[PDB]
Coordinates of all heavy atoms in Angstrom, one line a residue:
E16 N -125.1 57.0 167.9 CA -126.0 56.6 166.9 C -125.9 55.0 166.6 O -124.8 54.4 166.7 CB -126.0 57.4 165.6 CG -124.8 57.1 164.7 CD -124.9 57.8 163.3 OE1 -125.6 58.9 163.3 OE2 -124.4 57.3 162.4
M17 N -126.9 54.5 166.0 CA -126.8 53.1 165.3 C -128.0 53.0 164.3 O -129.1 53.7 164.5 CB -126.9 51.9 166.3 CG -128.3 51.8 166.9 SD -128.4 50.8 168.4 CE -127.7 49.2 168.0
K18 N -127.8 52.2 163.4 CA -128.9 51.8 162.5 C -129.9 50.8 163.1 O -129.4 49.9 163.7 CB -128.4 51.3 161.1 CG -127.7 52.3 160.2 CD -128.8 53.2 159.5 CE -129.3 52.8 158.2 NZ -128.3 52.7 157.1
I19 N -131.1 51.0 162.8 CA -132.2 50.0 163.1 C -133.0 49.8 161.8 O -133.8 50.7 161.4 CB -133.1 50.4 164.3 CG1 -132.4 50.9 165.6 CG2 -134.1 49.3 164.6 CD1 -133.2 51.4 166.7
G20 N -132.6 48.8 161.1 CA -133.1 48.7 159.7 C -132.6 49.9 158.9 O -131.3 50.2 159.0
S21 N -133.4 50.5 158.2 CA -133.1 51.7 157.4 C -133.1 53.0 158.2 O -132.8 54.1 157.6 CB -134.1 51.9 156.2 OG -135.4 52.1 156.7
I22 N -133.5 53.0 159.5 CA -133.6 54.2 160.3 C -132.3 54.4 161.1 O -131.7 53.5 161.7 CB -134.8 54.1 161.3 CG1 -136.1 54.2 160.5 CG2 -134.8 55.3 162.3 CD1 -137.3 53.9 161.3
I23 N -131.8 55.7 161.0 CA -130.7 56.2 161.9 C -131.3 56.6 163.3 O -132.1 57.5 163.4 CB -129.9 57.4 161.4 CG1 -129.3 57.0 159.9 CG2 -128.8 57.8 162.2 CD1 -129.2 58.2 159.0
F24 N -130.9 55.8 164.4 CA -131.4 56.1 165.8 C -130.3 56.8 166.5 O -129.1 56.3 166.6 CB -131.8 54.8 166.5 CG -132.2 55.0 167.9 CD1 -133.5 55.7 168.2 CD2 -131.5 54.6 169.0 CE1 -133.8 55.9 169.5 CE2 -131.9 54.8 170.3 CZ -133.1 55.5 170.6
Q25 N -130.6 58.0 167.1 CA -129.5 58.8 167.7 C -130.0 59.2 169.2 O -131.2 59.4 169.4 CB -129.2 60.1 167.0 CG -128.7 59.9 165.6 CD -128.2 61.1 165.1 OE1 -128.7 62.2 165.4 NE2 -127.2 61.1 164.2
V26 N -129.1 59.4 170.1 CA -129.3 59.9 171.4 C -128.3 60.9 171.7 O -127.1 60.8 171.4 CB -129.4 58.7 172.5 CG1 -130.4 57.8 172.2 CG2 -128.0 58.0 172.7
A27 N -128.7 61.9 172.5 CA -127.8 63.0 173.0 C -128.5 63.7 174.2 O -129.7 63.6 174.4 CB -127.6 64.1 171.9
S28 N -127.7 64.4 175.1 CA -128.2 65.2 176.2 C -128.4 66.6 175.7 O -127.7 67.0 174.8 CB -127.4 65.2 177.4 OG -127.4 63.9 178.0
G29 N -129.4 67.4 176.2 CA -129.6 68.8 175.9 C -131.0 69.3 176.0 O -131.9 68.6 176.6
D30 N -131.2 70.5 175.5 CA -132.5 71.2 175.5 C -133.2 70.9 174.2 O -132.8 71.4 173.1 CB -132.3 72.7 175.7 CG -133.6 73.5 175.7 OD1 -134.7 73.0 175.4 OD2 -133.5 74.7 176.1
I31 N -134.2 70.1 174.2 CA -135.0 69.7 173.1 C -135.6 70.9 172.2 O -135.8 70.8 171.0 CB -136.1 68.6 173.4 CG1 -136.6 67.9 172.1 CG2 -137.2 69.2 174.2 CD1 -137.4 66.7 172.5
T32 N -135.9 72.0 172.9 CA -136.5 73.2 172.2 C -135.5 73.9 171.3 O -136.0 74.7 170.5 CB -137.1 74.2 173.2 OG1 -136.1 74.9 174.0 CG2 -138.1 73.6 174.1
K33 N -134.3 73.5 171.3 CA -133.3 74.1 170.3 C -133.1 73.2 169.1 O -132.3 73.5 168.2 CB -132.0 74.3 171.1 CG -132.1 75.1 172.4 CD -132.8 76.5 172.2 CE -132.6 77.3 173.5 NZ -133.4 78.6 173.3
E34 N -133.8 72.0 169.0 CA -133.6 71.1 167.9 C -134.5 71.5 166.7 O -135.6 72.2 166.9 CB -134.1 69.7 168.4 CG -133.1 69.1 169.4 CD -131.7 68.7 168.8 OE1 -131.7 68.1 167.7 OE2 -130.6 69.0 169.4
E35 N -134.1 71.1 165.5 CA -134.9 71.2 164.3 C -135.2 69.8 163.8 O -134.3 68.9 163.7 CB -134.1 71.9 163.2 CG -134.8 72.0 161.9 CD -134.0 72.8 160.7 OE1 -133.2 73.6 161.0 OE2 -134.4 72.6 159.6
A36 N -136.5 69.5 163.4 CA -137.0 68.2 163.0 C -138.3 68.4 162.4 O -139.0 69.4 162.7 CB -137.0 67.1 164.1
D37 N -138.8 67.4 161.5 CA -140.1 67.6 161.0 C -141.2 67.5 162.1 O -142.1 68.3 162.2 CB -140.5 66.5 160.0 CG -139.7 66.7 158.6 OD1 -139.5 67.9 158.2 OD2 -139.4 65.7 158.0
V38 N -141.0 66.6 163.1 CA -141.8 66.5 164.3 C -141.0 66.6 165.5 O -140.0 65.9 165.6 CB -142.7 65.2 164.3 CG1 -143.2 64.8 165.7 CG2 -143.9 65.4 163.4
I39 N -141.4 67.4 166.5 CA -140.9 67.3 167.9 C -142.0 66.8 168.8 O -143.2 67.2 168.6 CB -140.4 68.7 168.4 CG1 -139.2 69.1 167.6 CG2 -140.1 68.7 169.9 CD1 -138.7 70.6 167.8
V40 N -141.7 65.8 169.7 CA -142.7 65.3 170.7 C -142.6 65.9 172.0 O -141.6 66.2 172.5 CB -142.4 63.7 170.7 CG1 -143.3 63.1 171.8 CG2 -142.6 63.0 169.4
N41 N -143.8 66.3 172.6 CA -144.0 66.7 174.0 C -144.5 65.6 174.8 O -145.4 64.8 174.3 CB -144.9 67.9 173.9 CG -145.1 68.5 175.3 OD1 -144.2 68.5 176.2 ND2 -146.3 69.3 175.5
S42 N -144.0 65.4 176.0 CA -144.6 64.4 177.0 C -145.3 65.2 178.1 O -144.7 65.9 178.9 CB -143.3 63.6 177.6 OG -143.7 62.7 178.5
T43 N -146.7 65.0 178.1 CA -147.5 65.9 178.9 C -148.5 65.1 179.7 O -148.5 63.8 179.8 CB -148.1 67.0 178.0 OG1 -148.8 68.0 178.8 CG2 -149.0 66.4 176.9
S44 N -149.5 65.8 180.3 CA -150.6 65.2 181.1 C -151.8 64.8 180.2 O -151.8 65.3 179.0 CB -151.0 66.2 182.1 OG -151.5 67.4 181.5
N45 N -152.8 64.1 180.8 CA -154.0 63.7 179.9 C -154.9 64.9 179.5 O -155.8 64.7 178.8 CB -154.8 62.6 180.7 CG -155.2 63.0 182.1 OD1 -155.2 64.2 182.4 ND2 -155.5 62.0 182.9
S46 N -154.6 66.1 180.1 CA -155.3 67.4 179.9 C -154.5 68.2 178.8 O -155.1 69.3 178.3 CB -155.5 68.2 181.1 OG -154.4 68.2 182.1
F47 N -153.3 67.8 178.4 CA -152.5 68.5 177.5 C -152.2 69.9 177.8 O -152.0 70.8 176.9 CB -153.1 68.3 176.0 CG -153.4 66.9 175.6 CD1 -154.7 66.3 175.8 CD2 -152.3 66.1 175.2 CE1 -154.8 65.0 175.4 CE2 -152.5 64.7 174.8 CZ -153.8 64.2 175.0
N48 N -152.1 70.2 179.1 CA -151.9 71.5 179.6 C -150.8 71.6 180.7 O -150.6 72.6 181.4 CB -153.1 72.3 180.0 CG -153.9 71.6 181.1 OD1 -155.0 72.0 181.5 ND2 -153.3 70.5 181.6
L49 N -150.0 70.5 180.9 CA -148.9 70.5 181.9 C -147.9 71.5 181.5 O -147.6 71.7 180.3 CB -148.3 69.1 182.0 CG -147.6 68.9 183.3 CD1 -148.5 68.8 184.5 CD2 -146.9 67.6 183.1
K50 N -147.2 72.2 182.5 CA -146.2 73.1 182.1 C -145.1 73.0 183.3 O -144.8 73.8 184.1 CB -146.7 74.6 182.1 CG -147.5 74.9 180.9 CD -148.0 76.3 180.9 CE -147.0 77.4 181.0 NZ -145.9 77.2 179.8
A51 N -144.5 71.7 183.2 CA -143.5 71.3 184.2 C -142.4 70.6 183.4 O -142.8 69.7 182.6 CB -144.2 70.5 185.3
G52 N -141.2 70.8 183.7 CA -140.1 70.2 183.1 C -140.1 70.4 181.6 O -140.2 71.5 181.1
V53 N -139.9 69.3 180.8 CA -139.9 69.4 179.4 C -141.1 70.0 178.8 O -140.9 70.9 177.9 CB -139.6 68.0 178.7 CG1 -138.2 67.5 179.0 CG2 -140.7 67.0 179.1
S54 N -142.2 69.7 179.4 CA -143.6 70.4 178.9 C -143.6 71.9 179.1 O -144.2 72.6 178.3 CB -144.8 69.7 179.4 OG -144.9 69.8 180.9
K55 N -143.0 72.4 180.2 CA -142.9 73.8 180.4 C -142.1 74.5 179.3 O -142.5 75.5 178.7 CB -142.2 74.1 181.8 CG -142.1 75.6 182.1 CD -141.3 75.9 183.4 CE -141.1 77.4 183.6 NZ -140.1 77.7 184.8
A56 N -140.9 73.9 179.0 CA -140.0 74.4 178.0 C -140.7 74.5 176.6 O -140.7 75.5 175.8 CB -138.7 73.8 177.9
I57 N -141.3 73.3 176.2 CA -142.0 73.1 175.0 C -143.2 74.2 174.8 O -143.2 74.9 173.8 CB -142.4 71.7 174.7 CG1 -141.1 70.9 174.3 CG2 -143.4 71.6 173.5 CD1 -141.3 69.4 174.1
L58 N -144.1 74.3 175.8 CA -145.2 75.2 175.7 C -144.8 76.7 175.7 O -145.3 77.5 174.9 CB -146.3 74.9 176.7 CG -147.2 73.7 176.4 CD1 -148.3 73.6 177.4 CD2 -147.7 73.6 175.0

């Protein structure tokens, strides 16, 4: 972790679908229906 102004910025390895946060981001296709890699796990 490090501070960027008032924000705490963190990095870690793992499965993002096990996290708790107000917002989780999905990285998908322009059709919003990809189910490969991270998008498969999220959907």
Side-chain angles (χ1 to χ4, degrees):
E16 79 170 26
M17 71 198 302
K18 287 287 269 299
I19 308 176
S21 63
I22 293 173
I23 301 153
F24 178 69
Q25 297 190 331
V26 299
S28 294
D30 180 352
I31 193 168
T32 70
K33 310 306 190 183
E34 293 290 312
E35 180 182 336
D37 289 326
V38 158
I39 294 169
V40 175
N41 184 24
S42 184
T43 189
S44 60
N45 56 19
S46 41
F47 304 99
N48 65 180
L49 201 69
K50 291 175 62 50
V53 291
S54 64
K55 182 184 176 192
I57 289 177
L58 289 186

